[PDB]
Amino acid sequence: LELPADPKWELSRARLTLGKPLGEGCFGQVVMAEAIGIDKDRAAKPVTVAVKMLKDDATDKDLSDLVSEMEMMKMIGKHKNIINLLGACTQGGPLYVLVEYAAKGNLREFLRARRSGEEQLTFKDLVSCAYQVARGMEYLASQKCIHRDLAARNVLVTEDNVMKIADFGLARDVHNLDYYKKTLPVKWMAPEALFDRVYTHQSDVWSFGVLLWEIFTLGGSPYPGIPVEELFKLLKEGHRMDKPANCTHDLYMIMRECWHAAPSQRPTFKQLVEDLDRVLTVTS
C-alpha cells in the first residue's frame, strides 16, 4: 500500500499483535489487538487497542475513506469522551488504524445487560452517561464536527465505564433509499435531516434526545412497533416519545427540549452539558 508516513503517528509492526474480530457484524474490518509502547508511562506494557483494517478485496475508495477518516481524527484532536486515534501502520504492509479499545461494547448492549443483576446501574450512573456523551458531543461540535448518526450503538463503553462517541469522522451516505428497505437510522434523525437532508449540530441535539431516551429505558428501542410510514406522519404532527418510567420530570424536559421542531429552539451541546451537570449536583 503506497501511502505517506506521518512519523508522529507511525507505529512499528513489531509492536502490534492482531487478535480476535470484534463483534459478529462487519467481521474482519475491526479486530482487537495489542500495542507495546502506547502508554508513555509504561513503555514495556502491551496495551489492548482496536484495529480497523481493509478487506482482502477492497476498492481504492475504501482505502481513501479509511485514510480520510484517520486524517479527520487528527484534525479534530483528542477528548476523553470520544474514541481516539492512537497510531497507524502505513508502511511495509497493510494499513492498520489504531483506536482506543472499549471492552464493555456499545452503550445499548451495555445498558441491556445491566437491566438486572449486580451490575445494575443507579440513576446517578445513567445521568453520568448522558453527561459524558454530551461532553464528547460538545467537543466535537466545537471542532466543527457533525456526527449525523448519534445513538447508543455509536457510543462505546470502556472497562473503566467511560463513554466514548465512535465513528464521528466517518463519512455516511445521506440516504440508502427514501425508504432504506434494508429492513434503524430514521428514528434518531431530526425532521430536517430526515425530510430535507439538512445536518447541523442542532440536528445532532435531536439525536441526543433520542439517545437520552435510550439511556433511561436502559437500551429501549425508540418508537417501538411504529412503522417508518407512520413515524413520518407522527413527527410532522408534533408527537414525541413518552417519558421513560424511571426518569425524572426535569430530565424529560431536557429530552423534550431536544425534540423542538425548530432547530434553534433546541439547546446547544454546551447547554446540555450544563443542564446534565446541574442534575448531577442536585443529587447529593
Q: Taking a C-beta distance cutoff of 8 angstroms, is the pair 156, 106 a contact? A: yes
141 touching ligand WGF, by CB under 6 A: no
Question: Does 155 count as an annotated binding residue?
Answer: no
Question: Does 24 count as an annotated binding residue?
Answer: yes
**Direct distance between the N- and C-terminal alpha carbons of the chain, in angstroms, rounded to an integer:** 56
Q: Based on CB atoms, which residue is closest to ligand WGF, 83 or 218? A: 83
Distance CA 257, CA 25 (A): 34
CB of 66 to ligand WGF, least distance (A): 6
133's grid cell: 456523551
156 touching ligand WGF, by CB under 6 A: yes
Which residues have a Cβ under 8 Å from the Cβ of 48 and sit 6 or more positions away?
A: 32, 33, 34, 101, 103
Distance CA 232, CA 186 (A): 9
Instruction: Using CB under 6 A, pick the residue from 37, 77, 105, 191 that binds ligand WGF.
Output: 105
29 touching ligand WGF, by CB under 6 A: yes
Instruction: Using CB under 6 A, pick the residue from 70, 218, 255, 258 that binds ligand WGF.
Output: 70
Instruction: Using CB under 6 A, pick the residue from 155, 166, 210, 218 that binds ligand WGF.
Output: 166
Binding mask 34-53 for ligand WGF (x = CB under 6 A): ----------------x-x-
Distance CA 280, CA 82 (A): 21
Question: Does 107 count as an annotated binding residue?
Answer: no
- Picking from 83, 138, 77, 73, the residue whose alpha carbon sits closest to that of residue 106 is 83
187 touching ligand WGF, by CB under 6 A: no
20 touching ligand WGF, by CB under 6 A: no
Question: Does 30 count as an annotated binding residue?
Answer: yes
Neighbours of 87 (CB within 10 A): 22
* Active-site residue set: 149
